[PDB]
Design a protein around this ligand. Structure first.
Ligand SMILES: NC(=O)c1ccc[n+]([C@@H]2O[C@H](COP(=O)([O-])OP(=O)(O)OC[C@H]3O[C@@H](n4cnc5c(N)ncnc54)[C@H](O)[C@@H]3O)[C@@H](O)[C@H]2O)c1
Ligand SMILES: *C(=O)CCCCCCCCCCCCC
Ligand SMILES: [Zn+2]
Lengths: 7, 292
């Protein structure tokens, strides 16, 4: 369960 | 099963339309991003001409934490005069109405999917939404609808809760923040039983939402309607988990339609003998919005 982020 | 095996008679729009006609294809998931709202006059990010072009930090949470006035200004600027869903929203509606949509998972916060008549049940707004807004104060969390929030964002007053005067924030997920619990729950159940992944208007750069495509079963066809190929494994990161392969000799189930999603969906609709139904819905619902 990560948090919103760019990639 | 993790056996990779080819269900599309060929890797094209017609192959997918045939697949959709088949009995094997009962449950469809859409994944959508800003591409499907661009034509409703709402900019995306990665588009060269509009997006991240006076004020990336205006959606990181800590920057919003320190200084929230920049965000509320942007949202007055981008805040559309009228909310007409696109042809591609309405295509999703058709899927609902024919009982083909298991779920639409969406990165968009514009609420258009609801305006097109997707229901809360149909919808994982994985990045939240402007539809609802809450006080940030734990002891309050008073809820507000989009009319109250607009009056503030257009008045140019920073929205403050009427009961306790904390900052009243729209229920979006900022960068940094965690996605809703419902996203993971729906993800656990949905991806067991999906027959077709329909991917529209997303670069698939934003995690964890991007990784959804690898949660599909390996023999689930995946159609991408987009301006650019997206989701291919990067040559370098892969070096060190179920990415898009449209072109190689190992390609077996992924298909790319490159163009506007309105044309793409309009094409697909046509193969399925839905074009008249789509034309009528879009024309009928816009008219109704025009008469509101
Ligand atoms: N409408 C919105 O709600 C909105 C708008 C901007 C950004 N965002 C947020 O920013 C992030 C950006 O994610 P994203 O991948 O959706 O946007 P993005 O800008 O990162 O990528 C959009 C993709 O859609 C394509 N595209 C744009 N218009 C198109 C069209 N008409 N037809 C076909 N393809 C089109 C672009 O080429 C690109 O591949 C998300 O987390 C999202 O929540 C949301
Ligand atoms: C995660 O990606 C959240 C992105 C923040 C929202 C982007 C800006 C879109 C605002 C459009 C105008 C208002 C829509 C009701
Ligand atoms: Zn409050």
């Amino acid at each position: 369960a990560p948090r919103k982020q760019l990639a | 099963g993790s056996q990779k095996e080819r269900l599309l008679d060929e890797l094209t729009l017609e192959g997918v339309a045939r697949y959709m006609q088949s009995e094997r294809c009962r449950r469809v998931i859409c994944l959508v991003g800003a591409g499907i709202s661009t034509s409703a006059g709402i900019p995306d990010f990665r588009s060269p001409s509009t997006g991240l072009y006076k004020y990336e930090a205006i959606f990181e949470i800590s920057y919003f934490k320190k200084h929230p006035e920049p965000f509320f200004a942007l949202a007055k600027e981008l805040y559309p005069g009228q909310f007409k869903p696109t042809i591609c929203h309405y295509f999703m509606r058709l899927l609902k109405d024919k009982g083909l949509l298991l779920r639409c998972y969406t990165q968009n916060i514009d609420t258009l999917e609801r305006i097109a008549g997707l229901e809360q049940e149909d919808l994982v707004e994985a990045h939240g939404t402007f539809y609802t807004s809450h006080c940030v104060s734990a002891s309050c969390r008073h809820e507000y609808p989009l009319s109250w929030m607009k009056e503030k964002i257009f008045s140019e007053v920073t929205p403050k809760c009427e009961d306790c005067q904390s900052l009243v924030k729209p229920d979006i997920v900022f960068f940094g923040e965690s996605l809703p619990a419902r996203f993971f729950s729906c993800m656990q159940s949905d991806f067991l039983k999906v027959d077709l992944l329909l991917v529209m208007g997303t670069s698939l750069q934003v995690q964890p939402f991007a990784s959804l495509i690898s949660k599909a079963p390996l023999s689930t066809p995946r159609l991408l309607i987009n301006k650019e190929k997206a989701g291919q494994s990067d040559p370098f990161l892969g070096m060190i988990g179920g990415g898009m392969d449209f072109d190689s000799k190992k390609a077996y189930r992924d298909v790319a339609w490159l163009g506007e999603c309105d044309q793409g969906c309009l094409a697909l609709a046509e193969l399925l003998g839905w074009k008249k139904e789509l034309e009528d819905l879009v024309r009928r619902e816009h008219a109704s919005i025009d008469a509101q």
